[PDB]
Amino acid sequence: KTTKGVQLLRGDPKKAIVRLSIPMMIGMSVQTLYNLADGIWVSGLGPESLAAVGLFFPVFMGIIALAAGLGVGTSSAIARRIGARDKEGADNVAVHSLILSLILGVTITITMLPAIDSLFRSMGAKGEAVELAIEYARVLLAGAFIIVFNNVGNGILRGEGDANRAMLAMVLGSGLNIVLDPIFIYTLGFGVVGAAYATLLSMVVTSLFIAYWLFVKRDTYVDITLRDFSPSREILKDILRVGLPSSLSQLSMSIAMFFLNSVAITAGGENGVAVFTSAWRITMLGIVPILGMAAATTSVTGAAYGERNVEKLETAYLYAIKIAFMIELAVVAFIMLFAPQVAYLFTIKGDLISALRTLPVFLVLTPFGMMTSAMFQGIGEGEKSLILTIFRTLVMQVGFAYIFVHYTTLGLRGVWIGIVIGNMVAAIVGFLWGRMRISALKKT
């Protein structure tokens, strides 16, 4: 005791938000850079390779949702203990999270492996290509524990204000994956399965770094040991109260993404899907800096909640919205001004430009509801974050998108407008709910 991250969490909230979110936004951007790169190599492999990825993709997102959920529940719980100066508690949460990483990770592997065959067959696919999907699935499912472990380890680092090493772990992993991708796919001629091995190997190396920090170097604020160790049902409940709704939040988005597609089909057709997919993929690029700010918000408000300092919690929460609002203003202005240039660099051109001229508007009010959810997780109330996510993406997004298409003259335009109007309302409601929760904290 202590570390720079702990001093950061216990210091100025405005200084904490900036110094924590920046490494997170960078780490997530490099991860996005990998997806853009991998999307290029695989695209030139054929229709059989793309069909194999699409079959395991929902399963992949399922693993990620569970891994990231356990991670944020870990970071939130650790941040609150450190704020409350509960050293033994923070140490105990870290140990619990690592044990859960083994339990959750291996369970995913042993559950999906024998079920991955009939799953691909049920999704209207005979193999042929489904057989290629299994081989691709085996590799990634083999490292399900590695995935969850890396998210937990990253969660521990974020929990004690160590966004630096957390960023490093993300950069090393995605960076190595960017390197191995063309080598495994083309140079070695492994095809699309090579991309799986490249990902698996990059994850393993990342784990070797994390394990070295946590178990070998042991230079972390929290102390990790099984001596003598004691199972805590309160710590388990504290992690799952944030972790589980965090995973279900991703399920809500995925379900919502499915219905938004169906509405885009009826508008619509394959032409409507192509435009929506392209417009959404570009728009969600500006979401990345908001996510990094959300991860910082959870840790800072969590530490402030542990310190029983509502003023510090409110400051960090409102300051995170302010910065993210300014960033999105630059992002939205860039996209709308240079829409034909952006559409040209990612390619239905006429419909895509109009979509980019209307859709990314919601990014402006997005931070108002996303930081509220982030601070809800920070104080340990993940259920409110789940309810807010369900309301935003299922009730508002799908709701308004279904109305402007089936009840109005607007075609594809009604889809973008519905998504924009929908979550902007949820942004106001979410923000208002945040002010009510903070007012209740002052009285408590």
Binding site: G27, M28, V30, Q31, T32, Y34, N35, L36, G39, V53, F57, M61, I64, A65, A67, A68, G71, I147, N150, N151, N154, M170, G173, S174, M203, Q250, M253, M257, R281, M284, I287, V288, L291
Partner: peptide, 10 residues
């Protein structure tokens, strides 16, 4: 990437 579920594939 792996630490953020909502991206998603691209």
């Amino acid at each position: 990437x792996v630490y953020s579920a909502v991206c998603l594939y691209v």
